Structure formats: structure tokens, C-alpha cells
């Protein structure tokens, strides 16, 4: 009801701006890579996939040549913001990951959702957490 799981279910996985569309899945992780909550649909990620993401936030652009993997699926890395946002694309779907002071906020989308909407959902939550000192 006020839990991390509620944050994911009600603030990441909500109907996007009344359009009738949703993210396919979402999660909130610590910057250390432990999951705080995820959606029932969030992919079966592996520990080294999460470490590579943590590395990409420390060494911007490391993944650009070879890709971002999550549950064995490859996303092509597109323009993000060093140490703060990682974006990726896979077909007409994608992924967006926003790092805060303490957390990383993941969003995964599939057509017809646009990358801008995923970015907007994940960044709105990420920015709120930063305001609460997280």
C-alpha cells in the first residue's frame, strides 16, 4: 500500500497518461544491484547483467558497442545521460533505466509505447525519489 511493490505496480505499471497503454514490466533495484521490487512480468535477469548495468553507470558508453543484455535479450544502447540514464532499443520495444542516489528504476516497453513515454514514466519516479533524498 505504501510498499516498494506498490511503487512499481501503481507508479511504473499504471496506464500511461490515459492512453490505454502500459509498460510491459518494471523494477526498482538498489545501486548495489539487489532488487527492491519488480513486476510479475519483469524478465529473469542474471546477476552479471545487473553488474554490467552498474558498470555502465560508472563508465558511461562501455556497453554501446556490444549491447545491453537482460534475461539473455539484447537491447541496442541508444543515447542516454552519463551516470544517470541508460536507454536501449530492441525492435519496436525498449528499456530505460534511471539511476538516483540510492536506486536504479527500470522500465521495459513494447509497441505501441514510445521510448519517450517509458523515459517519462521512469524519470518522473526517479526524480521523485531524488527529492525524497534517495
Amino acid at each position: 500500500s505504501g510498499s516498494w511493490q506498490t511503487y512499481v505496480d501503481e507508479h511504473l505499471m499504471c496506464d500511461i497518461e490515459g492512453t490505454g497503454q502500459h509498460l510491459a514490466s518494471a523494477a526498482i533495484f538498489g545501486t548495489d544491484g539487489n532488487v527492491w521490487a519488480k513486476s510479475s512480468s519483469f524478465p529473469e535477469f542474471k546477476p552479471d547483467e545487473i553488474n554490467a548495468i552498474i558498470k555502465e553507470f560508472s563508465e558511461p558508453g562501455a556497453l554501446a558497442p556490444t549491447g545491453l543484455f537482460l534475461a539473455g535479450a539484447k537491447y541496442m544502447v541508444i543515447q542516454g545521460e552519463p551516470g544517470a540514464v541508460i536507454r536501449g532499443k530492441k525492435g519496436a520495444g525498449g528499456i530505460c533505466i534511471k539511476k538516483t542516489g540510492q536506486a536504479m528504476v527500470f522500465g521495459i516497453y513494447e509497441e505501441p509505447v514510445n521510448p519517450g513515454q517509458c523515459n517519462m514514466v521512469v524519470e518522473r519516479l526517479g526524480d521523485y525519489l531524488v527529492d525524497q533524498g534517495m
Binding site: 505504501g2 516498494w4 511503487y7 538498489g30 539487489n34 527492491w36 525524497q132 534517495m134
Partner: peptide
């Protein structure tokens, strides 16, 4: 994890 802060609007 830290405790969730109050959820936003």
C-alpha cells in the same frame, strides 16, 4: 532497502 517514502500523486 530503505523504507519507502510516501507515494506521490
Amino acid at each position: 532497502p530503505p523504507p519507502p517514502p510516501p507515494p506521490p500523486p
